[PDB]
Each structure stands twice: as C-alpha cells, then as structure tokens.
Design a protein around this nucleic acid. Structure first.
Length: 67
DNA sequence: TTT
C-alpha cells in the first residue's frame, strides 16, 4: 500500500527529548527514485513523522533562494 | 509524528 526507504542521510537539524530527529534525507517512496525529504524520524527510523518531500528542482530552487 |  505504501513503502519507504532512506537511501541517504544528509543532515540532522535537531533532536527532541524522546529521541526523534528532524532530518534532511534522500528517501525513496514506493520504489520511486529518491527525493529530498525533510521530516521527523523515530530513533531507529522505523516510524515517520510529518514532513515534506521536495523534487531535486524544488530543493535547488530553495537553496538558490536563501543563499 | 506514515508517501
């Protein structure tokens, strides 16, 4: 019905009292090619939090715009 | 705290 795989870890932005982390990763959803993904994760990364997926073009637009 |  839905699958995910963290293909590459890029950056951790913060971690909270319960060990969950806000991360920028490259994530493959439903076997698609990996996309940038900014999201909260459980300590062992087996539970997903709320977040956003960005295409390469969307992520490059953001990076170009703020630095 | 699930695309």
């Amino acid at each position: 019905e839905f699958t995910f795989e963290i293909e590459e870890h890029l950056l951790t932005l913060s971690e909270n009292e319960k060990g969950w982390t806000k991360e920028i990763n490259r994530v493959s959803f439903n076997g698609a090619p990996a996309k940038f993904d900014i999201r909260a994760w459980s300590p062992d990364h087996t539970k997903m939090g709320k977040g956003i997926t960005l295409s390469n073009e969307e992520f490059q637009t953001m990076v170009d715009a703020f630095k």
